[PDB]
Design a protein around this ligand. Structure first.
Ligand SMILES: CC1(N)CCN(Cc2ccn3ncnc(Nc4cc(O)cc(Br)c4)c23)CC1
Length: 293
């Protein structure tokens, strides 16, 4: 570990325990000695050849003001490490789904989370970045009375700017080795093609099927190439057998997109809102992990 327990960063953030990472950087839960709340602290070695924290802080700062984004607390660089401190969130959607009796969320919870996640994807795209690792463990519910029903997008370590300085789409590289988690990667990512906005929406599509059905066909198939070949040959409409019928428009829309084209986020938002309206799903409903009725 880069930092041991009780290490104090900038005489303010006291490391409590490691909560993630290890390879590119490490993430800790820390005590803010000024404000007295716990926070998340990510560190990366100053000697590391591939350093992402400067880009990760840049995305986090650009997103301040948007919903579904952690508050920026601080950042810095010294001779041993670079660091970023941000608001700490709670339970992630991978753990919440596995804690459900049959490993599935209800359609009520699935669709409401889908709307929140779509909002966060449109937000990162609006500031010129792709997330590239949209997955349930990168979405966490709040941990406060003011946030416990809000879902947050986490971790910009694998993000990439898809625009130049003037808002134009950058050229795609001729090959781009995909970095994201195998289970939720799009077929385009599996082909090592430059990712676009549509590839983050493919990851959302797979997450929502997994939430409502409880599994994907390639779950626990670990080999990258084999998973991509299954997805390439799999009839995606078969994934929609027990999903709301309007998801066929979502699938058809994202299947029509290419690297360059801006998605129709409103079309996808309507798929979720219309699916909820038809089933009488309201925003005030308890999420599955909430008790008392
Ligand atoms: C599984 C994952 N990808 C995402 C979850 N973190 C652990 C975790 C648990 C609760 N929270 N709240 C805020 N930020 C977190 N991570 C975080 C990620 C960053 O990239 C930068 C910073 Br600062 C914190 C985090 C481990 C790496």
């Amino acid at each position: 570990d880069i930092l041991p327990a009780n290490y104090v960063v900038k005489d303010r953030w006291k490391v409590l325990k490691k909560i993630g990472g290890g390879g590119f950087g490490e993430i800790y839960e820390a005590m803010d000695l000024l404000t007295r709340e716990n926070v998340a602290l990510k560190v990366e070695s100053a000697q590391q050849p591939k350093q992402v924290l400067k880009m990760e802080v840049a995305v986090l700062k650009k997103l301040q003001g948007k919903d579904h984004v952690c508050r920026f607390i601080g950042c810095g660089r010294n001779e041993k490490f670079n660091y970023v401190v941000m608001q700490l969130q709670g339970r992630n959607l991978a753990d919440l789904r596995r804690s459900q009796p049959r490993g599935t969320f209800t359609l009520s919870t699935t669709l409401r989370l889908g709307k929140q996640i779509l909002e966060s994807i449109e937000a990162i795209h609006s500031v010129g970045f792709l997330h590239r690792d949209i997955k349930p463990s990168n979405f966490a519910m709040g941990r406060l009375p003011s946030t416990y029903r809000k879902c947050y997008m986490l971790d910009f370590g694998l993000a990439r700017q898809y625009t130049n300085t003037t808002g134009d789409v950058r050229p795609p590289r001729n090959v781009a080795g995909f970095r994201g988690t195998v289970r939720y990667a799009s077929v385009n990512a599996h082909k090592n093609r430059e990712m676009g906005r549509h590839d983050d929406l493919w990851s959302l599509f797979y997450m929502l099927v997994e939430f409502a059905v409880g599994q994907l066909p390639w779950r626990k198939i670990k080999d990258k190439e084999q998973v991509g070949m299954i997805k390439e040959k799999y009839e995606h409409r078969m994934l929609l057998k027990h999903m709301p019928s309007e998801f066929h428009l979502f699938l058809d829309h994202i299947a029509s997109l290419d690297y360059f084209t801006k998605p129709d986020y409103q079309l996808i938002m309507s798929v979720f809102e219309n699916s909820m309206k038809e089933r009488g799903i309201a925003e005030n409903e308890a999420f599955d992990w909430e008790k008392a009725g």
